Amino acid sequence: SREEFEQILQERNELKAKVFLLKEELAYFQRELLTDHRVPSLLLEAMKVAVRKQRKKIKAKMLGT
Amino acid sequence: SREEFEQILQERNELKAKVFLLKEELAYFQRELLTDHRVPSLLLEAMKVAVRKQRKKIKAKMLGT
Amino acid sequence: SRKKVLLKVIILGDSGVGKTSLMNQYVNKKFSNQYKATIGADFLTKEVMVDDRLVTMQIWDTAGLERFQSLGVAFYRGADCCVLVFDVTAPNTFKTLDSWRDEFLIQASPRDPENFPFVVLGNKIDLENRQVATKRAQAWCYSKNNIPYFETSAKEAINVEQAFQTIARNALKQETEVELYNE
Amino acid sequence: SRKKVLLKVIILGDSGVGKTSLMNQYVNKKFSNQYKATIGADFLTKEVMVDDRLVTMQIWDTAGLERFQSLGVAFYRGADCCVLVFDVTAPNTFKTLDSWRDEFLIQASPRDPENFPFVVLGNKIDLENRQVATKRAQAWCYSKNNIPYFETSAKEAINVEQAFQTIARNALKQETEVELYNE
Ligand SMILES: Nc1nc2c(ncn2[C@@H]2O[C@H](COP(=O)(O)OP(=O)(O)OP(=O)(O)O)[C@@H](O)[C@H]2O)c(=O)[nH]1
Ligand SMILES: Nc1nc2c(ncn2[C@@H]2O[C@H](COP(=O)(O)OP(=O)(O)OP(=O)(O)O)[C@@H](O)[C@H]2O)c(=O)[nH]1
Ligand SMILES: [Mg+2]
Ligand SMILES: [Mg+2]
């Protein structure tokens, strides 16, 4: 019933959207990385496997999982 | 009063958190870009000014702004 | 890699028809008998090929229950296409189709209203009971500006993939799609 | 560039004391007389220097109103430090400090409880009226495990920057901080 309801929701949307876009920008840059702006293959992949790895960690303590 | 309240909220948090982390990963990669993995300066900046620019666009139509 | 763009779909229709179920079925290939009234408005994103183009569809699910149709906060502005969904076994949900399509135009207010992509899904055809006839619904869709109509079954996934394919092509054939990140 | 890490601060205290106001003051250097009951639990992030280390503080604001203290969904687990905040002019808010600090430990349950960073902020000192004495509050903080105490004024920003500085240093001097993105 919470009158401020149109708040958390409206933000939930905004953030969901951002999270989609940032996801783009990344894979974008991540690609623009191995462009002629060249640099190792399989590694740039591990970098991912590195971040996504670290991500879990930090995010976890952020939300108290 | 909405019983599902502990839902939108709990997600609002999760997404806010993601948006923070993705922000890291970017500036990370964005830096890892001009590392010895070298590539122009001022440009990599315009790339930003490019995305952030495109971002506004897409995001806007996503949320119907 | 390849060029990318995004479409925004607004699924509308009375509470019950199967909007949430149709969306989940398409996006996650999942279904559930366990109902769960959708409040406010939320969305998902799915990427599929559309003629050498890589389109990401932003699918918005809305609330059919009037006492939850809160926001309506012009999250319609983007909308490159609008999906009018109803319960084939529930005649009223078909009766009020004009309510929604109209309502959409008034809110969204897209340039060239007489050509805006609309897809009508007649859901739940997997039930013996059936009060609305295909021909009837058909006669109606055409009667508008010859918009496509699909009898669907969010439950047994009938024409779900197929519905959204057309949903993807008509919105796209309208030039309104937004580019993505391709420097 | 330089190494980075993150801290998680949980600000607690009875509804009214100034938690939301203290946080905004620190993070955006802004204040507002217009109250606005905080429901559930939300957070912000700010980055500042802490001895050649670049720390990003994740500051959680919570609900002081029992009929909104919903979740509590162990979003406490991270917490490298907990800020116990009360209304200096409102004695009860000081009385119930044990309620909160205890409650915290029980939830968070951090290794080495007898050393977990705690910062006590006596807010609103910018009001003539005043029912709790600095010495009293002081006598209490020390009495715990000699935790720092700061008389603050979210309104005229008294010790706000200063409070969070110590909040940053004690949480950090506890080795619990999480690294960031530095390959
Ligand atoms: N048999 C059958 N049941 C369906 C079908 N589609 C949906 N349902 C059921 O009908 C209900 C409709 O569910 P939702 O998609 O969650 O909601 P909605 O009513 O369409 O929209 P809101 O009420 O506004 O959330 C659910 O209980 C589904 O299990 C279908 O094709 N066949
Ligand atoms: N004079 C004065 N007023 C303050 C000060 N800090 C906060 N206030 C006011 O007291 C109220 C406390 O506001 P919030 O920070 O929003 O809320 P809270 O009560 O601390 O926490 P919740 O009720 O759980 O949201 C507000 O109306 C503020 O304007 C302060 O240092 N001085
Ligand atoms: Mg729905
Ligand atoms: Mg608060």
Coordinates of C-alpha atoms and ligand atoms in Angstrom, one line a residue:
Chain A
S1 CA 0.0 0.0 0.0
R2 CA 3.1 2.2 0.6
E3 CA 2.5 5.5 -1.2
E4 CA 6.2 5.7 -2.0
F5 CA 5.8 2.4 -3.9
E6 CA 6.0 4.3 -7.2
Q7 CA 9.6 5.1 -6.0
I8 CA 11.4 1.8 -5.4
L9 CA 9.7 0.4 -8.5
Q10 CA 10.6 3.3 -10.8
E11 CA 14.1 3.0 -9.6
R12 CA 14.1 -0.8 -9.9
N13 CA 13.4 -0.2 -13.6
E14 CA 16.0 2.5 -14.0
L15 CA 18.7 0.3 -12.4
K16 CA 17.6 -2.8 -14.3
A17 CA 18.0 -0.7 -17.5
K18 CA 21.5 0.6 -16.5
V19 CA 22.6 -2.9 -15.7
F20 CA 21.7 -3.9 -19.2
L21 CA 23.5 -1.0 -20.8
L22 CA 26.6 -1.2 -18.7
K23 CA 26.7 -4.9 -19.8
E24 CA 26.8 -3.6 -23.4
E25 CA 29.5 -1.0 -22.8
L26 CA 31.6 -3.7 -21.2
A27 CA 31.5 -6.3 -24.0
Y28 CA 31.9 -3.3 -26.2
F29 CA 35.2 -2.2 -24.6
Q30 CA 36.2 -5.8 -23.9
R31 CA 36.0 -6.2 -27.7
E32 CA 37.4 -2.8 -28.5
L33 CA 40.3 -4.2 -26.4
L34 CA 41.3 -7.0 -28.7
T35 CA 40.6 -4.8 -31.7
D36 CA 43.7 -3.7 -33.7
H37 CA 44.1 -2.2 -30.3
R38 CA 45.3 -5.8 -30.1
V39 CA 46.2 -8.0 -27.1
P40 CA 46.2 -11.7 -26.3
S41 CA 43.0 -13.8 -26.8
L42 CA 42.4 -16.6 -24.3
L43 CA 43.9 -14.2 -21.7
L44 CA 41.4 -11.4 -22.2
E45 CA 39.0 -14.2 -21.5
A46 CA 40.6 -15.1 -18.2
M47 CA 40.5 -11.4 -17.4
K48 CA 36.8 -11.8 -17.6
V49 CA 36.9 -15.0 -15.6
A50 CA 39.0 -12.8 -13.3
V51 CA 36.6 -10.0 -12.8
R52 CA 33.4 -12.1 -12.9
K53 CA 35.3 -14.0 -10.2
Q54 CA 36.2 -11.0 -8.1
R55 CA 32.8 -9.6 -8.7
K56 CA 31.1 -12.5 -6.9
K57 CA 33.3 -11.7 -3.9
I58 CA 32.8 -8.0 -3.5
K59 CA 29.1 -8.0 -4.5
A60 CA 28.5 -10.7 -1.9
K61 CA 29.8 -8.7 1.0
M62 CA 27.9 -5.7 -0.4
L63 CA 24.6 -7.4 -0.1
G64 CA 25.6 -9.5 2.9
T65 CA 25.1 -12.8 1.1
Chain B
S1 CA 1.5 -2.4 2.5
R2 CA 2.2 -4.7 -0.5
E3 CA 3.5 -8.0 0.9
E4 CA 5.7 -8.4 -2.1
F5 CA 7.5 -5.2 -1.0
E6 CA 10.4 -7.1 0.3
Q7 CA 10.9 -8.0 -3.4
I8 CA 11.2 -4.8 -5.4
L9 CA 13.3 -3.4 -2.6
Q10 CA 15.6 -6.4 -2.3
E11 CA 16.1 -6.2 -6.0
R12 CA 16.5 -2.5 -6.0
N13 CA 19.5 -3.1 -3.7
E14 CA 20.9 -5.9 -5.8
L15 CA 20.8 -3.8 -9.0
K16 CA 22.1 -0.7 -7.3
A17 CA 25.1 -2.9 -6.2
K18 CA 25.6 -4.3 -9.7
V19 CA 25.5 -0.9 -11.2
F20 CA 28.3 0.1 -8.8
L21 CA 30.4 -2.9 -9.8
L22 CA 29.9 -2.7 -13.5
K23 CA 31.0 0.9 -13.1
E24 CA 34.3 -0.5 -11.7
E25 CA 34.8 -3.2 -14.3
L26 CA 34.4 -0.6 -17.0
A27 CA 36.9 2.0 -15.8
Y28 CA 39.0 -1.1 -15.1
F29 CA 38.9 -2.3 -18.7
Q30 CA 38.9 1.2 -19.9
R31 CA 42.2 1.6 -18.2
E32 CA 43.4 -1.9 -19.1
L33 CA 42.8 -0.6 -22.6
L34 CA 45.4 2.1 -22.5
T35 CA 47.8 -0.1 -20.6
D36 CA 50.8 -1.4 -22.4
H37 CA 47.9 -2.9 -24.3
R38 CA 48.3 0.7 -25.5
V39 CA 46.2 2.9 -27.7
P40 CA 45.6 6.7 -28.1
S41 CA 44.8 8.9 -25.1
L42 CA 42.3 11.8 -25.7
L43 CA 40.5 9.4 -28.1
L44 CA 39.8 6.7 -25.5
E45 CA 38.2 9.6 -23.7
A46 CA 36.0 10.5 -26.7
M47 CA 35.1 6.8 -26.9
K48 CA 33.7 7.4 -23.4
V49 CA 32.1 10.6 -24.4
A50 CA 30.8 8.5 -27.3
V51 CA 29.2 5.7 -25.2
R52 CA 28.0 8.0 -22.4
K53 CA 26.5 9.9 -25.3
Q54 CA 24.8 6.8 -27.0
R55 CA 23.9 5.6 -23.5
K56 CA 21.6 8.6 -22.9
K57 CA 19.9 7.8 -26.2
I58 CA 19.1 4.1 -25.7
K59 CA 18.4 4.3 -22.0
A60 CA 16.0 7.1 -22.7
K61 CA 13.8 5.1 -25.0
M62 CA 14.1 2.1 -22.7
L63 CA 12.5 4.0 -19.8
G64 CA 10.3 6.1 -22.0
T65 CA 11.8 9.4 -20.9
Chain C
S1 CA 31.3 -8.1 -34.1
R2 CA 28.0 -7.4 -35.8
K3 CA 25.7 -4.3 -35.7
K4 CA 23.2 -4.3 -32.8
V5 CA 19.9 -2.5 -32.0
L6 CA 17.1 -2.6 -29.4
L7 CA 13.3 -2.7 -29.6
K8 CA 10.9 -2.0 -26.9
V9 CA 7.7 -4.1 -26.6
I10 CA 4.8 -3.2 -24.3
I11 CA 2.6 -6.2 -23.6
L12 CA -0.9 -5.1 -22.4
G13 CA -4.2 -6.8 -21.6
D14 CA -6.6 -7.5 -18.8
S15 CA -5.4 -9.2 -15.6
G16 CA -5.4 -13.0 -16.2
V17 CA -4.9 -13.3 -20.0
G18 CA -1.4 -14.6 -19.7
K19 CA 0.9 -11.7 -20.4
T20 CA 3.4 -12.6 -17.7
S21 CA 3.2 -16.2 -18.7
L22 CA 3.6 -15.4 -22.4
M23 CA 6.7 -13.3 -21.7
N24 CA 8.4 -15.9 -19.4
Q25 CA 7.6 -18.7 -21.9
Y26 CA 9.4 -16.7 -24.6
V27 CA 12.3 -15.3 -22.6
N28 CA 13.2 -18.3 -20.3
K29 CA 11.2 -21.0 -22.0
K30 CA 9.5 -21.5 -18.6
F31 CA 5.9 -21.7 -17.4
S32 CA 4.1 -22.0 -14.1
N33 CA 0.5 -22.8 -13.1
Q34 CA 1.2 -20.9 -9.9
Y35 CA -0.2 -17.4 -10.7
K36 CA 1.3 -14.2 -9.2
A37 CA -0.4 -10.9 -10.0
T38 CA 1.9 -8.6 -11.7
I39 CA 2.0 -5.1 -10.1
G40 CA 3.4 -1.9 -11.5
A41 CA 5.4 -2.7 -14.6
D42 CA 8.7 -4.6 -15.2
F43 CA 10.7 -5.8 -18.2
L44 CA 13.1 -8.3 -19.6
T45 CA 15.6 -8.4 -22.5
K46 CA 16.3 -11.1 -25.0
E47 CA 18.7 -11.1 -28.0
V48 CA 17.8 -13.0 -31.2
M49 CA 18.8 -12.8 -34.9
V50 CA 16.6 -10.8 -37.2
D51 CA 18.1 -11.0 -40.7
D52 CA 21.8 -10.6 -40.1
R53 CA 20.8 -7.9 -37.5
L54 CA 21.3 -8.6 -33.8
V55 CA 18.2 -7.3 -32.0
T56 CA 17.8 -7.1 -28.3
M57 CA 14.2 -6.9 -27.3
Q58 CA 13.2 -5.0 -24.2
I59 CA 10.0 -6.7 -23.2
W60 CA 7.8 -4.9 -20.7
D61 CA 5.2 -6.8 -18.7
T62 CA 2.5 -4.7 -17.2
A63 CA -0.2 -4.9 -14.6
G64 CA -3.7 -5.9 -15.8
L65 CA -5.2 -5.3 -12.4
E66 CA -6.5 -1.7 -12.3
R67 CA -5.6 -1.4 -8.6
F68 CA -1.9 -1.8 -9.5
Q69 CA -1.7 -0.1 -12.9
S70 CA 0.1 2.6 -10.9
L71 CA 3.0 4.2 -12.7
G72 CA 2.0 4.1 -16.3
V73 CA 4.8 6.6 -16.1
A74 CA 5.2 6.9 -19.8
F75 CA 7.5 3.9 -19.8
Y76 CA 5.6 3.6 -23.0
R77 CA 7.5 6.3 -24.9
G78 CA 10.0 3.9 -26.3
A79 CA 7.6 1.2 -27.5
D80 CA 8.4 0.2 -31.1
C81 CA 5.5 -2.3 -30.8
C82 CA 2.6 -3.1 -28.5
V83 CA 1.3 -6.5 -27.8
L84 CA -2.5 -6.7 -27.1
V85 CA -3.0 -10.0 -25.1
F86 CA -6.4 -11.6 -24.1
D87 CA -7.8 -14.8 -22.6
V88 CA -9.5 -16.7 -25.4
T89 CA -11.8 -18.5 -22.9
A90 CA -12.6 -15.2 -21.3
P91 CA -14.7 -13.1 -23.7
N92 CA -14.5 -9.8 -21.7
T93 CA -10.8 -9.7 -22.1
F94 CA -11.4 -9.6 -25.9
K95 CA -14.2 -7.1 -25.5
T96 CA -11.9 -4.6 -23.9
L97 CA -9.2 -4.9 -26.5
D98 CA -10.1 -1.4 -27.8
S99 CA -9.6 0.0 -24.3
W100 CA -5.9 -1.1 -24.3
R101 CA -4.9 -0.3 -27.9
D102 CA -6.5 3.1 -27.6
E103 CA -5.0 3.7 -24.2
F104 CA -1.6 2.8 -25.7
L105 CA -1.8 5.3 -28.6
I106 CA -2.9 8.1 -26.2
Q107 CA 0.0 7.4 -23.9
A108 CA 2.8 6.4 -26.3
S109 CA 1.5 8.7 -29.0
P110 CA 3.9 7.4 -31.8
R111 CA 4.4 9.3 -35.1
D112 CA 2.4 7.6 -37.8
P113 CA -0.3 6.1 -35.5
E114 CA -2.0 4.4 -38.4
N115 CA 1.0 2.1 -38.9
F116 CA 2.4 1.4 -35.4
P117 CA 3.1 -2.3 -34.9
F118 CA 0.4 -4.2 -33.0
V119 CA 0.3 -7.9 -32.2
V120 CA -2.8 -9.6 -30.8
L121 CA -2.3 -12.8 -28.9
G122 CA -5.3 -15.0 -28.1
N123 CA -4.0 -16.9 -25.1
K124 CA -4.9 -20.1 -23.3
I125 CA -6.2 -21.9 -26.4
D126 CA -5.0 -25.1 -24.6
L127 CA -8.3 -25.1 -22.6
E128 CA -11.4 -27.0 -24.0
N129 CA -13.6 -24.1 -22.9
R130 CA -13.5 -21.3 -25.5
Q131 CA -15.8 -18.2 -25.8
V132 CA -14.0 -16.2 -28.5
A133 CA -13.7 -17.5 -32.1
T134 CA -10.5 -17.3 -34.1
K135 CA -12.4 -15.9 -37.0
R136 CA -13.9 -13.3 -34.7
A137 CA -10.5 -12.2 -33.3
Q138 CA -9.2 -12.4 -36.9
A139 CA -12.0 -10.3 -38.3
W140 CA -11.1 -7.8 -35.6
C141 CA -7.3 -7.6 -36.1
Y142 CA -7.6 -7.1 -39.8
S143 CA -10.4 -4.6 -39.2
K144 CA -7.9 -2.4 -37.4
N145 CA -5.0 -1.8 -39.7
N146 CA -4.5 -5.4 -40.6
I147 CA -2.4 -6.3 -37.5
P148 CA -1.3 -9.9 -37.1
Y149 CA -3.2 -12.2 -34.7
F150 CA -1.8 -15.3 -33.1
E151 CA -3.7 -17.9 -31.0
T152 CA -1.2 -18.8 -28.3
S153 CA -0.8 -21.1 -25.3
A154 CA 1.8 -19.7 -22.8
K155 CA 1.2 -23.1 -21.2
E156 CA 2.1 -25.5 -24.0
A157 CA 4.2 -22.8 -25.7
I158 CA 2.1 -22.5 -28.9
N159 CA 3.2 -19.8 -31.2
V160 CA 5.1 -18.1 -28.4
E161 CA 8.4 -18.1 -30.2
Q162 CA 6.5 -17.4 -33.4
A163 CA 4.5 -14.5 -32.0
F164 CA 7.5 -12.7 -30.8
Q165 CA 9.3 -13.3 -34.1
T166 CA 6.6 -11.2 -35.9
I167 CA 6.6 -8.8 -33.0
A168 CA 10.3 -8.4 -33.7
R169 CA 9.9 -7.9 -37.5
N170 CA 7.1 -5.4 -37.5
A171 CA 8.6 -3.2 -34.9
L172 CA 11.8 -3.3 -36.8
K173 CA 10.2 -2.6 -40.2
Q174 CA 9.2 0.6 -38.6
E175 CA 12.6 2.2 -38.5
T176 CA 12.1 3.2 -34.8
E177 CA 14.6 0.8 -33.4
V178 CA 17.6 2.4 -31.5
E179 CA 21.2 1.6 -32.4
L180 CA 23.3 0.0 -29.8
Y181 CA 27.1 0.2 -29.2
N182 CA 28.9 0.1 -32.6
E183 CA 31.6 2.9 -33.0
Chain D
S1 CA 46.1 3.5 -11.3
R2 CA 46.2 2.8 -7.5
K3 CA 44.9 -0.1 -5.4
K4 CA 41.2 0.0 -4.4
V5 CA 39.0 -1.6 -1.7
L6 CA 35.5 -1.3 -0.3
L7 CA 34.1 -1.0 3.2
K8 CA 30.5 -1.6 4.2
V9 CA 29.0 0.7 6.9
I10 CA 25.6 0.0 8.6
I11 CA 24.1 3.1 10.2
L12 CA 21.6 2.2 12.9
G13 CA 19.5 4.0 15.5
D14 CA 15.9 4.9 16.4
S15 CA 13.7 6.7 13.9
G16 CA 14.4 10.4 14.1
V17 CA 18.0 10.6 15.2
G18 CA 19.3 11.8 11.9
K19 CA 20.8 8.7 10.2
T20 CA 19.4 9.6 6.7
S21 CA 20.4 13.2 7.3
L22 CA 23.9 12.3 8.5
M23 CA 24.5 10.1 5.4
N24 CA 23.3 12.7 2.9
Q25 CA 25.3 15.4 4.6
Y26 CA 28.4 13.3 4.2
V27 CA 27.8 11.8 0.7
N28 CA 26.3 14.8 -1.1
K29 CA 27.0 17.6 1.3
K30 CA 23.3 18.2 1.4
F31 CA 20.7 18.5 4.1
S32 CA 16.9 19.1 4.3
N33 CA 14.5 20.0 7.1
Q34 CA 11.8 18.1 5.2
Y35 CA 11.8 14.7 6.9
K36 CA 11.0 11.5 4.9
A37 CA 10.8 8.3 6.9
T38 CA 13.3 5.8 5.6
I39 CA 11.7 2.4 4.9
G40 CA 13.4 -0.9 4.4
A41 CA 17.1 -0.3 3.8
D42 CA 19.1 1.5 1.1
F43 CA 22.8 2.5 0.6
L44 CA 25.2 4.9 -1.1
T45 CA 28.8 4.8 -2.1
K46 CA 31.5 7.4 -1.7
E47 CA 35.3 7.2 -2.5
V48 CA 37.9 9.0 -0.5
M49 CA 41.6 8.7 0.3
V50 CA 42.7 6.7 3.3
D51 CA 46.5 6.8 3.5
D52 CA 47.5 6.2 -0.2
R53 CA 44.6 3.7 -0.3
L54 CA 41.5 4.5 -2.3
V55 CA 38.5 3.3 -0.3
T56 CA 35.0 3.2 -1.5
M57 CA 32.5 3.2 1.3
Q58 CA 29.2 1.4 0.9
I59 CA 27.0 3.3 3.3
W60 CA 23.7 1.6 4.3
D61 CA 20.9 3.7 5.7
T62 CA 18.3 1.8 7.6
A63 CA 14.8 2.2 8.9
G64 CA 14.4 3.3 12.5
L65 CA 10.7 2.8 12.4
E66 CA 9.9 -0.7 13.6
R67 CA 6.9 -0.9 11.3
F68 CA 9.3 -0.7 8.3
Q69 CA 12.4 -2.6 9.6
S70 CA 11.2 -5.3 7.2
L71 CA 14.1 -7.0 5.4
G72 CA 16.9 -6.9 7.9
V73 CA 17.8 -9.6 5.3
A74 CA 21.3 -10.0 6.5
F75 CA 22.5 -7.2 4.4
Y76 CA 24.5 -6.8 7.5
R77 CA 26.9 -9.7 6.7
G78 CA 29.4 -7.4 4.9
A79 CA 29.5 -4.7 7.6
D80 CA 33.1 -3.8 8.3
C81 CA 31.8 -1.2 10.8
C82 CA 28.5 -0.2 12.4
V83 CA 27.4 3.3 13.2
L84 CA 25.1 3.7 16.2
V85 CA 23.3 7.0 15.8
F86 CA 21.0 8.8 18.3
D87 CA 19.2 12.1 19.0
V88 CA 21.1 14.0 21.7
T89 CA 17.9 16.0 22.5
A90 CA 15.9 12.7 22.7
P91 CA 17.1 10.7 25.7
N92 CA 15.3 7.4 24.7
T93 CA 17.3 7.2 21.5
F94 CA 20.3 7.0 23.7
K95 CA 18.7 4.6 26.1
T96 CA 18.1 2.1 23.4
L97 CA 21.7 2.1 22.1
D98 CA 22.3 -1.3 23.5
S99 CA 19.3 -2.6 21.6
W100 CA 20.9 -1.7 18.3
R101 CA 24.6 -2.6 19.0
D102 CA 23.5 -5.9 20.4
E103 CA 21.0 -6.5 17.5
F104 CA 23.9 -5.8 15.2
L105 CA 26.3 -8.4 16.6
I106 CA 23.5 -11.0 16.6
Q107 CA 22.8 -10.4 13.0
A108 CA 26.1 -9.6 11.5
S109 CA 28.0 -11.9 13.8
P110 CA 31.5 -10.8 12.9
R111 CA 34.7 -12.8 13.9
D112 CA 36.3 -11.1 16.9
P113 CA 33.1 -9.4 18.2
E114 CA 35.1 -7.7 21.0
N115 CA 36.9 -5.5 18.4
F116 CA 34.4 -4.8 15.7
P117 CA 34.5 -1.1 14.7
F118 CA 31.6 0.9 16.2
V119 CA 31.1 4.7 15.9
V120 CA 28.5 6.5 18.1
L121 CA 27.1 9.7 16.7
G122 CA 25.2 12.1 19.0
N123 CA 23.2 14.0 16.5
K124 CA 21.3 17.3 16.5
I125 CA 23.6 19.1 18.9
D126 CA 22.6 22.2 17.0
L127 CA 19.4 22.5 19.1
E128 CA 19.4 24.4 22.4
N129 CA 17.3 21.6 24.1
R130 CA 19.6 18.8 25.1
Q131 CA 18.8 15.8 27.4
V132 CA 21.9 13.6 27.0
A133 CA 25.3 14.8 28.2
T134 CA 28.5 14.4 26.2
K135 CA 30.2 13.0 29.2
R136 CA 27.4 10.5 29.7
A137 CA 27.6 9.4 26.0
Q138 CA 31.3 9.4 26.3
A139 CA 31.3 7.4 29.6
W140 CA 29.2 4.9 27.7
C141 CA 31.2 4.5 24.5
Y142 CA 34.5 4.0 26.3
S143 CA 32.6 1.6 28.6
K144 CA 31.9 -0.6 25.7
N145 CA 35.2 -1.5 24.0
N146 CA 36.4 2.1 24.0
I147 CA 34.6 3.0 20.7
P148 CA 34.8 6.6 19.5
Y149 CA 31.9 9.0 20.0
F150 CA 31.2 12.1 18.0
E151 CA 28.7 14.8 18.7
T152 CA 27.3 15.7 15.3
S153 CA 24.9 18.0 13.6
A154 CA 23.7 16.7 10.2
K155 CA 22.1 20.1 9.9
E156 CA 25.1 22.3 10.3
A157 CA 27.5 19.5 9.2
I158 CA 29.4 19.3 12.5
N159 CA 31.9 16.4 12.5
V160 CA 30.0 14.7 9.7
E161 CA 33.2 14.5 7.5
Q162 CA 35.1 13.9 10.6
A163 CA 32.9 11.1 11.9
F164 CA 33.1 9.1 8.6
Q165 CA 36.8 9.6 8.5
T166 CA 37.2 7.6 11.7
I167 CA 34.4 5.3 10.5
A168 CA 36.7 4.7 7.5
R169 CA 39.9 4.1 9.5
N170 CA 38.6 1.7 12.2
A171 CA 36.8 -0.5 9.7
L172 CA 40.0 -0.5 7.6
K173 CA 42.2 -1.2 10.5
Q174 CA 40.2 -4.4 10.9
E175 CA 41.5 -6.1 7.7
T176 CA 38.0 -7.0 6.7
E177 CA 37.9 -4.7 3.7
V178 CA 37.4 -6.3 0.3
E179 CA 39.8 -5.7 -2.6
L180 CA 38.4 -4.1 -5.7
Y181 CA 39.5 -4.5 -9.3
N182 CA 43.3 -4.6 -9.5
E183 CA 44.7 -7.4 -11.7
Ligands
LIG1 N1 -4.0 -23.2 -19.5 C1 -3.3 -22.1 -19.6 N2 -3.1 -21.3 -18.5 C2 -2.4 -20.2 -18.8 C3 -1.9 -19.8 -20.1 N3 -1.2 -18.6 -19.9 C4 -1.3 -18.3 -18.7 N4 -2.0 -19.2 -18.0 C5 -2.3 -19.1 -16.5 O1 -3.2 -18.0 -16.3 C6 -2.7 -17.1 -15.4 C7 -2.2 -15.8 -16.0 O2 -0.9 -15.5 -15.4 P1 0.1 -14.3 -15.6 O3 0.7 -14.3 -17.0 O4 0.9 -14.4 -14.4 O5 -0.8 -13.0 -15.4 P2 -1.7 -12.1 -16.3 O6 -3.0 -12.3 -15.7 O7 -1.7 -12.6 -17.6 O8 -1.4 -10.6 -16.0 P3 -1.4 -9.9 -14.6 O9 -2.6 -10.4 -13.8 O10 -1.6 -8.4 -14.9 O11 -0.1 -10.2 -13.9 C8 -1.6 -17.9 -14.6 O12 -2.2 -18.6 -13.4 C9 -1.2 -18.9 -15.6 O13 -0.8 -20.2 -15.0 C10 -2.1 -20.6 -21.2 O14 -1.7 -20.5 -22.4 N5 -2.8 -21.8 -20.9
LIG2 N1 18.4 20.5 13.9 C1 18.7 19.3 13.4 N2 17.8 18.5 12.8 C2 18.3 17.4 12.3 C3 19.6 16.9 12.3 N3 19.8 15.7 11.7 C4 18.6 15.4 11.3 N4 17.6 16.4 11.6 C5 16.2 16.4 11.2 O1 15.6 15.3 12.0 C6 14.9 14.4 11.1 C7 15.7 13.1 11.0 O2 15.7 12.7 9.6 P1 16.3 11.5 8.8 O3 17.7 11.4 8.8 O4 15.5 11.6 7.5 O5 15.6 10.2 9.5 P2 16.0 9.3 10.8 O6 14.9 9.6 11.6 O7 17.2 9.8 11.3 O8 15.8 7.8 10.4 P3 14.5 7.1 9.8 O9 13.3 7.7 10.5 O10 14.6 5.7 10.1 O11 14.4 7.5 8.3 C8 14.7 15.2 9.8 O12 13.5 15.9 9.8 C9 15.9 16.2 9.8 O13 15.6 17.4 9.2 C10 20.6 17.7 13.0 O14 21.8 17.5 13.2 N5 20.0 18.9 13.5
MG3 MG 1.6 -9.6 -16.0
MG4 MG 17.0 6.7 7.8

